[PDB]
Amino acid sequence: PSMDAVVKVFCVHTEPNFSLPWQRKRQYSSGSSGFIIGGRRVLTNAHSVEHHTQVKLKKRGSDTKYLATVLAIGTECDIALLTVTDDEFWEGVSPVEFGDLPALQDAVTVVGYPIGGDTISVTSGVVSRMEILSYVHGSTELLGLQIDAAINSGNSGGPAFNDKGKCVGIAFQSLKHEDAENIGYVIPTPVIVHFIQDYEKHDKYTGFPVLGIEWQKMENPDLRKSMGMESHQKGVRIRRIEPTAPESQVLKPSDIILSFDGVNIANDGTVPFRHGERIGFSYLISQKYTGDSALVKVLRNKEILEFNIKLAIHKRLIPAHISGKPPSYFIVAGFVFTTVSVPYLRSEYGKEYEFDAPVKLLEKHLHAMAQSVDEQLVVVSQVLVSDINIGYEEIVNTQVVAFNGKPVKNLKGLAGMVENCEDEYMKFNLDYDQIVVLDTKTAKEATLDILTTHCIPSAMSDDLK
Amino acid sequence: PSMDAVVKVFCVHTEPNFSLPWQRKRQYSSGSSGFIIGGRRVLTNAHSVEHHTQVKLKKRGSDTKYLATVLAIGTECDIALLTVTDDEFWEGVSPVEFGDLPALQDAVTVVGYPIGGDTISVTSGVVSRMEILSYVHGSTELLGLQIDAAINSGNSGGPAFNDKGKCVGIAFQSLKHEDAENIGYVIPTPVIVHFIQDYEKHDKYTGFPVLGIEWQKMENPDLRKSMGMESHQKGVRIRRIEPTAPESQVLKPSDIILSFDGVNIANDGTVPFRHGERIGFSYLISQKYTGDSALVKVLRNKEILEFNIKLAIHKRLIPAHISGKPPSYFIVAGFVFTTVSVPYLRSEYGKEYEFDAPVKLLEKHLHAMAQSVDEQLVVVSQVLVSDINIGYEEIVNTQVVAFNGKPVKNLKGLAGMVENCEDEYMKFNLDYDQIVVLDTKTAKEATLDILTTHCIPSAMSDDLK
Amino acid sequence: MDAVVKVFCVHTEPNFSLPWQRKRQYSSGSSGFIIGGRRVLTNAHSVEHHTQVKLKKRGSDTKYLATVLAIGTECDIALLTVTDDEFWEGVGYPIGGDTISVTGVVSRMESTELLGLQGNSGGPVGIAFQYVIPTPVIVHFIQDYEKHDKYTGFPVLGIEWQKMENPDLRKSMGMESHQKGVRIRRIEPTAPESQVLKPSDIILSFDGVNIANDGTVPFRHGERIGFSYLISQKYTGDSALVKVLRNKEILEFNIKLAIHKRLIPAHISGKPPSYFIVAGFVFTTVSVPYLRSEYGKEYEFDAPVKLLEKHLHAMAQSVDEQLVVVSQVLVSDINIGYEEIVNTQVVAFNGKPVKNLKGLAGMVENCEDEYMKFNLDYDQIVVLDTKTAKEATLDILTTHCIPSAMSDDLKT
């Protein structure tokens, strides 16, 4: 106990097809775990209800499935917040109550449901370490608890209790470990508290802020001396700054970040966390709210400066997810133009896309920064075969970089240049020094019959209409 | 302890051959578990003594096997009630005593004997859920306990104890789970009490009543409005009524059942069961005794009606079992006529008969209702090859629907029409628009020599003589 | 050998489970060969759902866009052409190769069949596929095209029959000892012969060929074959003389032969699948491609028994009768409580029998009643408020990226 607050989550999903962005896949149902908390609220994983079209909740002792409402989705922290109108669902359950951030080697008990099973499952372990990690690959890294108990579909989203019967967070199945390694994570209470308090204040999820920099350790003493650091000072060198984090352009490459909100940062980027414990300084940042300001102290040209910087969320050139929105696409003459995101790469190349995708794309995934707030990697995804595009059918996942001499910044820009093209020819500059040339008049005329052939409702996603 | 009341059941079985209904299979012995209770009584599974010709009981500390008496067999609840004349068997054992219906996640300890072993085995688990389930496939669904401990031959029939040393029911091996899933059932004490009290009152088993209806949920609000339901009312729509449950013909299709014996029924067919627990409304029905009456409240034509309905057992067109009776058959000219039951289908098509039997038969198994109290599905089972039936040898498991223009209602009817046939020809209308024609005089004369060839004692089962 | 061409095929095939969509393009390579009359021969399965077939001659650098002339589904043969005259100026190809190959056992022997058991499919004997497609099938296929100017398939006698091997059965129906044949069990209502033939007729002969008690006719010395072989040799629209015993008398009918109309069609000749949607209820018609797409290759065991019964045993009672099901329910507030309805037959709409998909779609459009009441199989009903159910449809289509509430054939 209290087992009666631990519910099963039935979710009907309607996933976009990122490879065929005019399609939604067949409806399917998934089950996971979740739990009732104070104030007529239920907590589960964000991944358990992504692309939801209906959510239902089932208590362990009753056949009845209750229609639920999704209140907010925190994708970066993998939390969803639900409610239920039916008062019968709430009646007679004592809500889960939250405990303090656990100590290492503290006992933890994870309560949930097996895969495809409707009976309670109970899994035991210890907190093996504190960690900063992504809950969505390629997305912002947050505080987490690592536990020596494996988590699998089913129990992820159930509560994790300390020996005092208090919940210390939401179970989370590891993305980077095989199920037999018996390692799992718990989304901890300060992350949970960040997400609920964020919703309670803004009536919406507003994300987790980042500073918008990459950094390099300062552990070599000649490096420190050569940039004016006094022998008591320590910190990290700024390698690069996101062009699209404008509040951070007050910072500059090769600044030495000395402290953040007063907390002293070491040469390896760690800050003190608790007795005998050190953690990366990003936990100081991600515990703030988007829009919060932070005191950053740097060494610049052997002199100390202090900046108050408004913090924002990270904008990735190739986004880790697109918030459940439909992927954007545009078609002309059977050429399918779309943008590159992580779900696109996963759907095109499978689980190992970080090794099987084209190196041109991997470069941009691993290393490129967006140069503008609206920049997108635009590609020819595929060519829908037809007479108008004879000779081009082999083109797959190749960046479009220019149209009739003008650079392509994003998909909407390219859709605009194709619509307003008055030249005799449409000349696309592709990657690998390729060009695609189409007669403007005959290519626009060819589009409709291709749409029909492939049952494409429209030549573009609504966001471009 | 108290291990000394947990006995081994040795049973000699003489099973009918449903594929060759003139034969009894070779005697064989099976062992299972059972336990002594108050009043010179032993409890075991019904399946452990089906087709019994002798039962013996062995206590764990003594070589001696005691000749037992079968008092009653409750097939639907899988319980057999035995006694023993020898007073030495009873002397010095403290009888098992029964506890209350357990709560979810309560500890349960199952005591029995391994397969082919005569030493005590002890298995531990928790009650994982309350359930309504069939203990014989295709037979009436009853209250049961699901436990996270697997049960296998051997221990099924042993007692299940709560931590207070009280028995909360009889172990039961799952029909729908592989042994490695570690899931089993316990026939609970209110079912046990139903069966003993039933015997103690009628000097015989009288079964578990059903209402005789199929129903459809009422969870859609337009469905509810369109049939006059006020916003506070809830219940289920009657889809169909068994023709042979005449006390229920007072009900009518599209009645909305609102409550049963006062208990309010929800739109999903659940009723409250305990604190925070809901179960299907059939538990209200099957806890009554055959012959009991029940108050049923329906909405009919937007108006409330209340009926007092005498409850009876379910009569299935294709019966789930035939109570250990011998299967009926009738032979003429080497044509073997028999009726279709579940044991017949199992013996003809194996464990997967619900996928391997002819679709014509599966339809009737899954969906047909008996149209009369004595209706039977009659089939040609096989043709015993002989000159008189040349050209017909391939006919297998095909329904007989008419004889000389008259419909076949059951096997006895067909046996009567063949005996009193005065026409020159016997013309059987079979399924798939086939006919079998035989010269009446020569076919009746051919029968005896076929019986002899196949060592068939008689042309019919005794029930047709 | 310079008349053996390479055949690149790009396929776009429908989703029978989601009939508003087309699966992703995929490509096949095959062979083919040129014959007389500006005509190219290949396999059917190698150009099924072709969106573009181009052809490439031996040793040539040019791929010519083809036009497929006829696809013979029942017999796995197709036939293409190319409008450019340069293509017609004056054994097959390995996968991924543009060079001719010439190859197991050949010999080694051992709608209705041709019955011969045991890079690159398409080439030139007859048409290989990967056995060799024989020439007695090709010629029927070609001569069918060369006559109808399209493919019409192979005719059938729309009857089921039972052997007449048992003496007493024969005597009871008046068959003299020398007479042999098969007894009609049932006749397809949508066959022309359902007029003139009757149940329990004994079919004795077909175009003067005597039919045995077990349904076979002579074939070669020492070998017989089922009489359906005779009927499949004819062409659609041909006449045939069918001689029967009825009430102990001999009658001979001249019957114009026709294509089989199956209630659950074995395929739909590459036409798109049809669907109709209202308030998230997806209605469609049961075909074998549907059952296969819904339930896998074991569909004859995993599909619901109600549908399996129709598939194995039902005859269409009308020429346009279809088996209409609720395929699935696209969940939305309008259809709350109905979401578990899957592949269940619709039998009536507001009291009136449903005969086919277009019929059902018409009744919904013209429904002026307050409620829409669908009688489903398993004695179920679906009730929706007519005004709000029609109003809810559009957003459900939007959510699922469905272009309209129905397939084009239902706009008709």
PDB file of N, CA and C in Angstrom, chain A residues 354-379:
ATOM      1  N   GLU A 354      21.703   7.170 -35.703  1.00  0.00           N
ATOM      2  CA  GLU A 354      22.907   7.948 -35.440  1.00  0.00           C
ATOM      3  C   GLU A 354      24.140   7.328 -36.069  1.00  0.00           C
ATOM      4  N   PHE A 355      24.011   6.133 -36.630  1.00  0.00           N
ATOM      5  CA  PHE A 355      25.063   5.530 -37.418  1.00  0.00           C
ATOM      6  C   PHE A 355      24.670   5.263 -38.863  1.00  0.00           C
ATOM      7  N   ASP A 356      23.371   5.162 -39.180  1.00  0.00           N
ATOM      8  CA  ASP A 356      22.936   4.766 -40.522  1.00  0.00           C
ATOM      9  C   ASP A 356      22.433   5.916 -41.384  1.00  0.00           C
ATOM     10  N   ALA A 357      22.111   7.065 -40.799  1.00  0.00           N
ATOM     11  CA  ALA A 357      21.691   8.223 -41.566  1.00  0.00           C
ATOM     12  C   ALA A 357      22.877   8.791 -42.343  1.00  0.00           C
ATOM     13  N   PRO A 358      22.620   9.539 -43.416  1.00  0.00           N
ATOM     14  CA  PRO A 358      23.731  10.138 -44.166  1.00  0.00           C
ATOM     15  C   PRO A 358      24.587  10.997 -43.256  1.00  0.00           C
ATOM     16  N   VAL A 359      25.892  10.952 -43.501  1.00  0.00           N
ATOM     17  CA  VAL A 359      26.830  11.729 -42.713  1.00  0.00           C
ATOM     18  C   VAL A 359      26.555  13.223 -42.834  1.00  0.00           C
ATOM     19  N   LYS A 360      26.111  13.693 -43.999  1.00  0.00           N
ATOM     20  CA  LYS A 360      25.727  15.107 -44.097  1.00  0.00           C
ATOM     21  C   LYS A 360      24.681  15.467 -43.051  1.00  0.00           C
ATOM     22  N   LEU A 361      23.674  14.606 -42.865  1.00  0.00           N
ATOM     23  CA  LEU A 361      22.648  14.899 -41.879  1.00  0.00           C
ATOM     24  C   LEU A 361      23.171  14.708 -40.465  1.00  0.00           C
ATOM     25  N   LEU A 362      23.950  13.642 -40.226  1.00  0.00           N
ATOM     26  CA  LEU A 362      24.485  13.403 -38.889  1.00  0.00           C
ATOM     27  C   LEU A 362      25.325  14.573 -38.414  1.00  0.00           C
ATOM     28  N   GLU A 363      26.164  15.120 -39.289  1.00  0.00           N
ATOM     29  CA  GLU A 363      26.904  16.331 -38.945  1.00  0.00           C
ATOM     30  C   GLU A 363      25.988  17.393 -38.363  1.00  0.00           C
ATOM     31  N   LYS A 364      24.845  17.628 -39.007  1.00  0.00           N
ATOM     32  CA  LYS A 364      24.008  18.746 -38.587  1.00  0.00           C
ATOM     33  C   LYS A 364      23.280  18.423 -37.307  1.00  0.00           C
ATOM     34  N   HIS A 365      22.929  17.148 -37.141  1.00  0.00           N
ATOM     35  CA  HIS A 365      22.320  16.654 -35.917  1.00  0.00           C
ATOM     36  C   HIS A 365      23.280  16.805 -34.740  1.00  0.00           C
ATOM     37  N   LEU A 366      24.524  16.349 -34.901  1.00  0.00           N
ATOM     38  CA  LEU A 366      25.450  16.339 -33.781  1.00  0.00           C
ATOM     39  C   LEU A 366      26.110  17.693 -33.518  1.00  0.00           C
ATOM     40  N   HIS A 367      26.250  18.561 -34.531  1.00  0.00           N
ATOM     41  CA  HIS A 367      27.175  19.681 -34.393  1.00  0.00           C
ATOM     42  C   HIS A 367      26.642  21.040 -34.809  1.00  0.00           C
ATOM     43  N   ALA A 368      25.620  21.116 -35.650  1.00  0.00           N
ATOM     44  CA  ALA A 368      25.219  22.415 -36.150  1.00  0.00           C
ATOM     45  C   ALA A 368      24.401  23.147 -35.106  1.00  0.00           C
ATOM     46  N   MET A 369      24.559  24.465 -35.077  1.00  0.00           N
ATOM     47  CA  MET A 369      23.656  25.345 -34.350  1.00  0.00           C
ATOM     48  C   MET A 369      22.760  26.070 -35.339  1.00  0.00           C
ATOM     49  N   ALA A 370      21.491  26.225 -34.983  1.00  0.00           N
ATOM     50  CA  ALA A 370      20.626  27.109 -35.755  1.00  0.00           C
ATOM     51  C   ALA A 370      21.230  28.511 -35.802  1.00  0.00           C
ATOM     52  N   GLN A 371      21.303  29.083 -37.003  1.00  0.00           N
ATOM     53  CA  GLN A 371      21.780  30.450 -37.165  1.00  0.00           C
ATOM     54  C   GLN A 371      20.665  31.485 -37.055  1.00  0.00           C
ATOM     55  N   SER A 372      19.411  31.052 -36.982  1.00  0.00           N
ATOM     56  CA  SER A 372      18.287  31.966 -36.862  1.00  0.00           C
ATOM     57  C   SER A 372      17.132  31.221 -36.213  1.00  0.00           C
ATOM     58  N   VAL A 373      16.211  31.995 -35.632  1.00  0.00           N
ATOM     59  CA  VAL A 373      15.130  31.445 -34.823  1.00  0.00           C
ATOM     60  C   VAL A 373      14.193  30.561 -35.638  1.00  0.00           C
ATOM     61  N   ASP A 374      14.134  30.768 -36.951  1.00  0.00           N
ATOM     62  CA  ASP A 374      13.244  30.018 -37.823  1.00  0.00           C
ATOM     63  C   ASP A 374      13.987  29.123 -38.811  1.00  0.00           C
ATOM     64  N   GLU A 375      15.294  28.929 -38.645  1.00  0.00           N
ATOM     65  CA  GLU A 375      16.035  28.104 -39.594  1.00  0.00           C
ATOM     66  C   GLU A 375      15.581  26.650 -39.507  1.00  0.00           C
ATOM     67  N   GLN A 376      15.512  25.982 -40.657  1.00  0.00           N
ATOM     68  CA  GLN A 376      15.208  24.558 -40.690  1.00  0.00           C
ATOM     69  C   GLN A 376      16.099  23.873 -41.705  1.00  0.00           C
ATOM     70  N   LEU A 377      16.441  22.623 -41.430  1.00  0.00           N
ATOM     71  CA  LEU A 377      17.094  21.809 -42.443  1.00  0.00           C
ATOM     72  C   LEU A 377      16.009  21.277 -43.360  1.00  0.00           C
ATOM     73  N   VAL A 378      15.988  21.756 -44.594  1.00  0.00           N
ATOM     74  CA  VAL A 378      15.006  21.329 -45.582  1.00  0.00           C
ATOM     75  C   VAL A 378      15.636  20.262 -46.464  1.00  0.00           C
ATOM     76  N   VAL A 379      14.902  19.176 -46.724  1.00  0.00           N
ATOM     77  CA  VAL A 379      15.383  18.128 -47.609  1.00  0.00           C
ATOM     78  C   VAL A 379      14.301  17.774 -48.613  1.00  0.00           C
TER      79      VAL A 379
END
